[PDB]
Write an enzyme that holds these catalytic residues in place. Sequence first.
Site, PDB file in Angstrom:
ATOM      1  N   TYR A 199       8.980   1.705  -3.806  1.00  0.00           N
ATOM      2  CA  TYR A 199       8.500   0.539  -3.078  1.00  0.00           C
ATOM      3  C   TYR A 199       9.287  -0.708  -3.427  1.00  0.00           C
ATOM      4  O   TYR A 199       9.479  -1.581  -2.573  1.00  0.00           O
ATOM      5  CB  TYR A 199       7.028   0.360  -3.371  1.00  0.00           C
ATOM      6  N   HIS A 212       0.102  -2.575   0.198  1.00  0.00           N
ATOM      7  CA  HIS A 212       0.731  -1.823  -0.879  1.00  0.00           C
ATOM      8  C   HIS A 212       2.235  -1.992  -0.876  1.00  0.00           C
ATOM      9  O   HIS A 212       2.859  -1.843  -1.937  1.00  0.00           O
ATOM     10  CB  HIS A 212       0.365  -0.343  -0.802  1.00  0.00           C
ATOM     11  N   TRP A 213       2.805  -2.364   0.273  1.00  0.00           N
ATOM     12  CA  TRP A 213       4.234  -2.656   0.298  1.00  0.00           C
ATOM     13  C   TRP A 213       4.562  -3.795  -0.626  1.00  0.00           C
ATOM     14  O   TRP A 213       5.618  -3.793  -1.252  1.00  0.00           O
ATOM     15  CB  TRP A 213       4.690  -3.005   1.686  1.00  0.00           C
ATOM     16  N   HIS A 254      -1.946   8.482   9.728  1.00  0.00           N
ATOM     17  CA  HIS A 254      -0.584   8.468   9.217  1.00  0.00           C
ATOM     18  C   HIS A 254      -0.048   9.858   8.892  1.00  0.00           C
ATOM     19  O   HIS A 254       1.177  10.091   8.944  1.00  0.00           O
ATOM     20  CB  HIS A 254      -0.596   7.589   7.984  1.00  0.00           C
ATOM     21  N   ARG A 299      12.098   7.250   5.808  1.00  0.00           N
ATOM     22  CA  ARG A 299      12.973   6.127   5.512  1.00  0.00           C
ATOM     23  C   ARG A 299      14.284   6.617   4.924  1.00  0.00           C
ATOM     24  O   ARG A 299      15.366   6.166   5.323  1.00  0.00           O
ATOM     25  CB  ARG A 299      12.280   5.169   4.553  1.00  0.00           C
ATOM     26  N   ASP A 354       7.086   9.147   6.393  1.00  0.00           N
ATOM     27  CA  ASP A 354       6.790   8.087   5.433  1.00  0.00           C
ATOM     28  C   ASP A 354       8.069   7.778   4.650  1.00  0.00           C
ATOM     29  O   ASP A 354       9.111   7.573   5.286  1.00  0.00           O
ATOM     30  CB  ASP A 354       5.593   8.553   4.575  1.00  0.00           C
ATOM     31  N   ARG A 355       8.035   7.731   3.310  1.00  0.00           N
ATOM     32  CA  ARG A 355       9.243   7.372   2.554  1.00  0.00           C
ATOM     33  C   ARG A 355      10.364   8.327   2.911  1.00  0.00           C
ATOM     34  O   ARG A 355      11.514   7.921   3.031  1.00  0.00           O
ATOM     35  CB  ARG A 355       9.011   7.440   1.051  1.00  0.00           C
TER      36      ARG A 355
END
EC number: 3.8.1.3
Lengths: 299, 298
Positions: free
Chosen positions: A217, A153-154, A278, A112, A108-109
């Site tokens: 975000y 939510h993005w 996820h 990234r 997830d984040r």
Amino acid sequence: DLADLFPGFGSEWINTSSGRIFARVGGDGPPLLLLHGFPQTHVMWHRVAPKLAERFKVIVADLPGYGWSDMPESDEQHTPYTKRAMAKQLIEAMEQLGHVHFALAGHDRGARVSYRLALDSPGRLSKLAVLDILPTYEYWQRMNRAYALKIYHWSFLAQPAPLPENLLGGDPDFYVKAKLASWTRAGDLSAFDPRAVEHYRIAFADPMRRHVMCEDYRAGAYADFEHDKIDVEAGNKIPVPMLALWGASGIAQSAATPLDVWRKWASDVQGAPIESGHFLPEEAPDQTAEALVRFFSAA
Amino acid sequence: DLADLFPGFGSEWINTSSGRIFARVGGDGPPLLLLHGFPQTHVMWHRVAPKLAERFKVIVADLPGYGWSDMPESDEQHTPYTKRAMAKQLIEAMEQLGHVHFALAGHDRGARVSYRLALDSPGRLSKLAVLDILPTYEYWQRMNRAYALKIYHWSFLAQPAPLPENLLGGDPDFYVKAKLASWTRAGDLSAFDPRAVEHYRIAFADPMRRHVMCEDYRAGAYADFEHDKIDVEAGNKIPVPMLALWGASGIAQSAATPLDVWRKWASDVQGAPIESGHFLPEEAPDQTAEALVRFFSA
């Protein structure tokens, strides 16, 4: 009364120029950094990290601003919560432990951060695994009606402060549990260790922590996207051997076939779907752990 | 503690098969229905309706489920809050007043009702004015990063219940004021009459009203889109003479150039930018009213 979900792992507060990084550290062997994502903390790895600690020095870090890591004050560009900055800060953290070349798996984040780290500073990584993501650019470039609904939510969390913060503040528990639940295969909290959920909920209960997640975000909608855009338009590819794992019911595969996307970003990528939503390391700990062990211990 | 912002307008509760429509009614002459949008009520017309009432029988209606109109029970397809159902309900409301052929100006959600009305039942309309919208299809078709961030609430409010309802309940006064301010040219609440803001605030303070608004946006993500899509694919055009007004710094401008888009959707459309954010009748009432009067009088 937050539970210790990494029995026998140490706890390290790593100073960096941008604040302390909290991590659980266990195992021995080549260093492996695990990065969680949203709305989680390092404890999402608690079911796979012990397996990993059999073969690796496993460093299970809270992302800058998450969990028990310090929260750098943000700014109008959300700089500290851009993945570029987070990567740089985690590079610093690992250098504090003497790890200048390490393996990295992010979810997830955290994934990234990881691919951004690999793009900015590939020399730091032996191998990279990313769990259930596509690059931030690809999510935004694939932001049609269907996907805008799926990952609303993005765009919601990236709204200017304090709009998301104010709405999240009314019933934080509801939202963190909602996001945990909605992205699992089952659609509920059953995949999660209840003790893990309590970690996530407690982190989410802190308005500053929530603000950080929105900053994350916000960076995801702006600077992160811009940084990705530069690389993809420059044809910059991650040169680090990488594994792309995604959940068959996860977010990544909603946007696109994940391996085809990653083969655009990465010159040496292998990938495998896992029957999971996820939250691969919690919904599918055994499969996730085996995939990671196989990948990271391959020479 | 709600001001009457339409001195001399009557107040009509119009019975329909799906529940009452509240309307302020003023003026005389040809009937002109004014439909507000989100997150407002009919009082958003309070600065332009008096000028219109000089020449028309102005009916300033709360959309079904909004303001003081009744809230029909929704269903898993958000049917009563689809623009097609709202249009049918408003047509029934107008028939209760003996208005089967009327002029219609809509803003925001009300404009979506209005062009859907125009597509479904064009014989009901003499003339149509839409304020600061593109068809719902167009918003979703042009969905990209830029639009997703700008009209995030299209996907946020369309999330399955109770997610948006619950979040909106976290700070509803903040949310409605934030929407009002953020879509104006000024960026604050100064273009609004504080007594109108109070109307918007109190309507938004009701969870059931907020649920309705989410039902409206869920409709706008699903059935409203599908209904528009059929029209696009069939090449159905609005045959009603229509005016598209948009704010120089409004929602409709961004993603597309409003007149060119509406010309794909309507055979006879004229349009003009208004020096305004989204809330044309409140940010730019003289210009909006002028434009409407001229179009509806012509």
